[PDB]
Subunit: 263 residues, 6 copies
């Protein structure tokens, strides 16, 4: 229901969940045109009141994404590369400010720009046989410049991130799970359904609160504790005035099922 | 030594103060409880003899289930705002107090209950204590007493986000593995093993322990280059302390240090 | 071919893009002000040496990497001298995160107090499986880990976990250190130096300009808010896009051949 | 005609959305721990009163707003007590910036030391043109402005100017205070109270929910990196967009008529 | 290339200077469509290596901008408003990350969202007869929600900004200059010219240094000093490797006129 | 008096004076900074020094910045390290116990202003000349803290305007934008600067010192914890000899006998 296809990407919308399917090429190596579409999708989904969760997945076998297209980067003026990197970063930055919870469904290789895109998502689920995950940019004389060095350091620790970034080595889904690089490892041929089940459980709950919780944590982490709780407190104020908060406190007190409306 | 309030009791002995929570069957609090809790924190702050504070529940299956849902029902939204602000500022005080605060978790520690525990410096839980987490989302609201923020900083933002949006609670063992608690003791030995730890602290160079607690809890909020400056001033206070003179000597003379906490 | 320069507290060896700072102060490598003055000089020297891309800090003392500050020297000093002694040591350790070279602490023995603090200031920490004890026992003396210990430990392994270790002063094993993220690798004791050098060799033999800018991006970027941290990362990347290794690296990849890194 | 509630060292008056906290400790309004407990209590009471939109802090003592801490009280306390005393006073002042009411310090007399620190903690400062002296002379006593004075002054008028004023301990005039941004207004001595009240009444009679969220946005948002500070500003705005006053305010503007504010 | 147009705005590119002329409404009150065009103008200029300076000005008499359209805002639902505000904010946030120096030429009223846009620019020049400047949002029951409260506080001081925001009172160009709300105050008639003169001088200098100086200050101000200087250092490293640094450096020794090339 | 190649250090009555006598326009190189750094370390370990004044022995210049000849010669990688060292040296001032005062009697531009900026206070003469950052006219920026310290001192927009045009300003204008703390009649700039320093050295110097540290380092911290830092510095003061002597003298209304401890 309501699926708008594009050149390198397709968006499916249904039951409060939007699915952004990637299909750029055989390794999903992106260029500036792909990000233009990806950015347009986030904007579109942001303005869509119905969507509570966005799952980002790949339609390309064995690959979620391998990163930027090296061939596209060859005939690139340095100043162009700069603006190209800047636009990709700003696009990824938008996810943390969006009301929907973004989930990266990793079924294939997620390296370089590929992992950077997943790191920008709120959560990451991976198949027990998805392959490699990491940032090998160093093997090309460059670094993970799409927030990879900064987001990985914050996600798994600055020392562990430094190790991975300088050696450019990739790891397994199981290893990514233990260091917190991903939130869940599901059996391979069961990754999509288990991801969708999680997203479905979110879409059918107090979605206004799940969204505010998402904003509280993602943007509050950049703030000094004493004022971060002020930000958290304003998001709560909005919830205290919502319909679901009333319906929720009631249903609980009446031992009945809550009728979530998302507002 | 003993000071009983309506929802809480404070026991002081051998440099250790224990705050016992006895609000109700699930220890679900209201504004009145927090006023008493705040008063206890202030009283203990002005008592130079207390070096460690252990917060524990006298209620069987609960440390604290959080805010009394009924008490907040139909309460004015502006009131809730002020109620939350007061509860937050009260919890914020722990990180600025000289005593090391330890949360002794023997029962369920959820919602406001966990938020209170998160504001403590350390957390020790029993292997059969139950569940621990933030289920607020199931009510259409969030962990607004510092839960979203302190959990994110303690166990990681992504892991905290996952727990907060699903509202699912985990076990003590799981909590230990992700760093949500510092120790998991045999249920029946939880209280004694916590007191044991507290006693070792209270019998050591307590001025150092105190300044160490301050350096870390408040220093973590500063850029590293100036945080070490803060750590430095706390060190300057220790270098001029009596225990520091005694500690350096007792060490060179291969003997047992006689700490005074000064 | 291989140059070696020595002093009384430490010796610096330089070879094929790697510098090794060997510590030989005393039975437990307990340091004083003069030691740090030499360590600081080594850092400055290495910084101004374009050929060095990696630095390994190791100890030539049997059972110790370093037990921290010399209590004999530490005491007997005026509180104002201690303040300045500590400030200088901290500023010295602070210089590592700002240096182009990747600093690796090769831990083969006890690494406690100031010893661990020095190790915490390095970019990576590798320890032997029989290296001994690692922790911050300063509290047992009535003082605290004042050379960055309380702050760096908290940021590395978590504030509550660091609080616990600092207030009790208890030390842990190499294995336990590995599980909480205190060290990055635990190698078989007799292979510690070997495997550490092997790791450094691989770095020195790769796109060292990228390696260097990556280290700067993370160590200094972690102190900035995310939205601007990526800007700092972007400028470091700009420098890399303008380097020769980048050109070389991209060509070798498309032309499917081993790239020949020049470090610039 | 305001509702009046008197304490031992202060009196709180309430009327038409405005609360006034009158200080009457002693001849120089030098405070002790008891005063601050009453001040803290007043802040809490007002916070829980949804009718109060603005709070004006003023003195009933002729030539002094407040000269700071009672030096007698301060001299006889254990250093550990002083620490807790200062900590309590600071936390009390910190609460102003988190409160929904706009706090205005009405300075008609000398405002020095802890007196200025209390004023610095308020959102705005209005001073009469013959109020006297203002500054932090703590250094002349061998101590510093420990109630947030060094920090808030630096942030308000600039760190170098604040440093100069703190290290010398010299006070300045209301006109000099105004030019460096230490106070927001200088009114004729004779009508300093009425004009402060007039400013307060305009606020209290406007879209108070917007005034409050604006005060919160700026005072707490200034502690956040810009990219997320605007997110905080955004949630406060979201609360207004859902307010009754926003609907009315926008309508009144379109209908070119006077808004009927409800504060909700 | 040329001086391309759009609906509510037109961009003129010439000799390293791009002028964004606003012509939205008789008061230049904007809506979402306008910001979309403004965002597009920003992106286009970014990817144009020849543009060094960007001048934003109004073609509408007596108004630089009066802010958002109250009709567009009044009737919109809360959730839409949120996304609308978020988009405008992210658009303005981009100016500080752009290589070009942004100058706001204020010849008419600059209030509410109008001032907020000017605040997001690097510099502000205003005519001595330009009229009023301030944030009157509070008189509508809302606040300066597009970076207004935050940038004003950082620019002129939190307490002064607070005073201005809660009273909604606007001030004169002269008073604005006194508090640093604007950088220059030119004679009304000589405003567009003096602004272009200043922009001309910039475009004819070591333009790479100017760009990096702007990036160093606008983004570095968000960092703790000790690392802010590291950021300044990397931007400097780029300058040390540029052709202009080598030029201006030697030219300086040779008591000669530097021939800048922007690289 | 302790003399060095590029500078000289004079110590007396609790005040240390670092006189710059590098060259014609006091345009520095790496060696100069190695000496400045050494001076800072020496002064730090001298419990007698309470104030430090940086002044020039050169008539029309405080300092014109980095020596362009010495610079051009350098390789890009050397420049990085050269700058890094200079920056770290200037950073040490904000962490030192002494209050640093830059005495500006001549031109203070580029690296010259960057050095002055790292000092705690700046006093300048009404006929001292120009002050600013003209690095842009060379194709580079004020890479030794200039862009960052200026922005924080006079405001980011005003600093941006000055940095991109490289325009220098007069002493009077500097005072107006807060670039300097004082402007004295040329002839009495050193005299009046030394009076200020003298009044500092003769007061409760431990307090003056902790105040300088509280402000300079606390400004890099969030307010809620910055006040904690301020609090610990105050705890040290409450335990000093002077605090007791200061509190007494006031209640006994007698001039206090400071000891600096």
């Amino acid at each position: 229901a309501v699926e708008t296809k594009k050149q390198y990407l397709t968006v499916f919308k249904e039951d409060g969940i939007a699915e952004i399917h990637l299909h750029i090429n055989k390794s999903n190596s992106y260029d500036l045109e792909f990000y233009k579409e990806f950015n347009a999708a986030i904007d579109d989904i942001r303005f869509d009141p119905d969507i509570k969760v966005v799952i980002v997945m790949s339609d390309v076998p064995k690959f979620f994404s391998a990163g930027a297209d090296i061939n596209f980067l060859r005939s690139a003026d340095p100043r162009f590369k700069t603006q190209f990197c800047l636009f990709c970063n700003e696009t990824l930055d938008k996810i943390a400010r969006s009301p929907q919870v973004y989930i990266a469904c990793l079924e294939g290789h997620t390296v370089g720009g590929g992992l950077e895109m997943a790191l920008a998502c709120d959560l990451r689920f991976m198949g027990d046989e998805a392959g490699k995950i990491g940032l090998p940019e160093v093997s090309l004389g460059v670094l993970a410049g799409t927030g990879g060095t900064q987001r990985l350091a914050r996600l798994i620790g600055y020392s562990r991130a430094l190790d991975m970034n300088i050696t450019g080595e990739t790891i397994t889904p199981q290893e990514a799970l233990e260091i917190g690089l991903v939130n869940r490892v599901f059996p391979q041929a069961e990754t999509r359904e288990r991801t969708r089940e999680y997203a479905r459980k979110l879409a059918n709950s107090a979605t206004y609160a799940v969204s505010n919780i998402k904003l509280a944590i993602m943007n509050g982490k950049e703030m000094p504790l004493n004022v971060a709780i002020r930000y958290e407190g304003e998001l709560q104020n909005l919830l205290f005035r919502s319909e679901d908060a009333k319906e929720g406190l009631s249903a609980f007190l009446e031992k009945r099922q809550p009728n979530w409306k998302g507002i």
